[PDB]
Design a binder for these strands. Structure first.
Lengths: 315, 300
DNA sequence: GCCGCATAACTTCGTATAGCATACATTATACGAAGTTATCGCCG
DNA sequence: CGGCGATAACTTCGTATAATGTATGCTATACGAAGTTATGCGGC
């Protein structure tokens, strides 16, 4: 440990700093390698292409997702470059191994996984159910869900939202500007969020964040700083899935329940089935032209084939 | 030439997989390079970045398309790689020249050219013209075209099609499963057309056998249990019919002076775009991944 | 009115996995041409 | 009379140009889990 700690501090003395995810993951990798390499009683710091290859094949016996391994290799080349060692690990052995394990895993026919959608029908059902709720937590949560299903923001960005951002206007319509884009909230959900705001008294200071901690007492306490409890919001999605359905399946699989994506996905598919003009959608999404969108669209019934009819028809 | 044969067989040593197209084009690039390099009396096998520079300058003096010059560069990289030599031609000079000549070529403002469209209206016209025709080879060609405009594929895909592929159903509708795959449907009038072809020809009694097989100047057809690779001949059909609706080609020698294998697919695509409907599901049925090319079929 | 200590909400960590902009690597097309084939023409 | 001439109807080849694909350097995320706080629920 102290070896990697020291080496990473010596790198940090270059005063380059990664993303926190980046640096985290990097250190994790360094741990993993040094531990396996010591287990094989090989020098942990200086790599060897046959030792790296053996490691890689050990990982393949571990059954890891190829992408992971690839990521490992990337990390290693990164370390070389930024250490000033040969950025590429010796490509013949490395690339031949990569090609082998790539093709061998592709031959499994495995898929890049997709989060389950959250439907508009589910949203309407949970609205009908929770609208009866007197619990301010339930009011807040339904308001949050309505906001999400309108705006489809990044979860961290909806967590970022701060009362100085928010404005509302005729009909009770509400508008929120963020770095710089303003999005509009439709009248009924402006009234719902007003109910939340007024009942909680949360964030009377516009510095303060719209959603704030609520104790088991049922008491909100405002915060002048972000709670960042995105894991808690994910727990909300779990709870609501565990309300419309039971607990998660015992398979230990991912995507066994709704996730912060799932609403985004759902509304995207809803717009696709509505068939509204595509560039409109992409502009509203702030979105690069992306076949991801079409992988959404991919999962839809539209296969009418009318041209056979029109050929037979039209006469 | 035999020197080039020896040289390329030598480098072909350390054999590795290619498409036949890829190996053909590789060998053609090697021909061009070896001829040029011998003309320059330079070492044929080892590269030098100043030699690559001079070669590229010569290719620019020939005014070849920058895409093809780049492709040659690519091929050179390839041969280094697979022979075990350094992939990159020394990048800073190479890249700088690349960029500069790229800019200079884009400064020409040239267009991506597009094949001559074909319409339902054209189909109607040619059908009205040829429906009187007794020649079974004409019935063959027309049946072929009516399928193509129903299905709008690669020419290779339609070539593959085998009588075992084909079935027909209620209303006399006919369905064909193709690729790994998709089943497509044939509209009634062209069903009757293709049935006339099949019944008159007697072709492919075994469903192994292909729907279209050779004709003879005798006015005779010979069935084939094997793919005949008609496709170039099918292009000849497209050209012949173009030379029926019009005279000979212009002497400009340009591409897209007449209908091409694209022409039916692109045509029906624009037809649907003018119908203005079903964008994603029709793109699905044609199998395109979303691309600006689709837009420039649609754009007008 | 203090000790016990709970459920709950929340922080942090681990690791297995998913996004994506770009350069340049792999496959196909469009075309003019040479070369085939076997079948009929038909001399006198 | 049946040869070669000529053909239809076809195939293999060489040229130049595009369409198609992906992996690379950097980012963020899904789900379990231990651990944390805390104050309020329970007793006498």
């Amino acid at each position: 440990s102290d070896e990697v700690r020291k080496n990473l501090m010596d790198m940090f003395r270059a005063r380059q700093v990664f993303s926190e995810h980046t640096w985290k993951m990097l250190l994790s990798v360094c741990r993993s390698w040094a531990a396996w390499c010591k287990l094989n009683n090989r020098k942990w710091f200086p790599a060897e292409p046959e030792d790296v290859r053996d490691y890689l094949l050990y990982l393949q016996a571990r059954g890891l997702a190829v992408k992971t391994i690839q990521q490992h290799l990337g990390q290693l080349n990164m370390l070389h470059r930024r250490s000033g060692l040969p950025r590429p690990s010796d490509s013949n052995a490395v690339s031949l191994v990569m090609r082998r394990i790539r093709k061998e895993n592709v031959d499994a026919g495995e898929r890049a996984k997709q989060a389950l959608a959250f439907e508009r029908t589910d949203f309407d059902q949970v609205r009908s159910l929770m609208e009866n709720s007197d619990r301010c937590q339930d009011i807040r949560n339904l308001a949050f869900l309505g906001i999400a299903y309108n705006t489809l923001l990044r979860i961290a960005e909806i967590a970022r939202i701060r009362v100085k951002d928010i404005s509302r206007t005729d009909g009770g319509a509400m508008l929120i500007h963020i770095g710089g884009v303003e999005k509009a909230l439709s009248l009924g959900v402006t009234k719902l969020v007003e109910r939340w705001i007024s009942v909680s008294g949360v964030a009377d200071d516009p510095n303060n964040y719209l959603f704030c901690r609520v104790r088991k007492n049922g008491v909100a306490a405002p915060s002048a700083t972000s709670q960042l409890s995105t894991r808690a919001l994910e727990g909300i999605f779990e709870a609501t899935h565990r309300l419309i359905y039971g607990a998660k399946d015992d398979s230990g699989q991912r995507y066994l329940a709704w996730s912060g994506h799932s609403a985004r996905v759902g509304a995207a598919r809803d717009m696709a089935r509505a068939g509204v003009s595509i560039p409109e959608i992409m502009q509203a999404g702030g979105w690069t032209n992306v076949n991801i969108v079409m992988n959404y669209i991919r999962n839809l019934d539209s296969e009418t084939g009318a041209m056979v009819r029109l050929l037979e028809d039209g006469d």
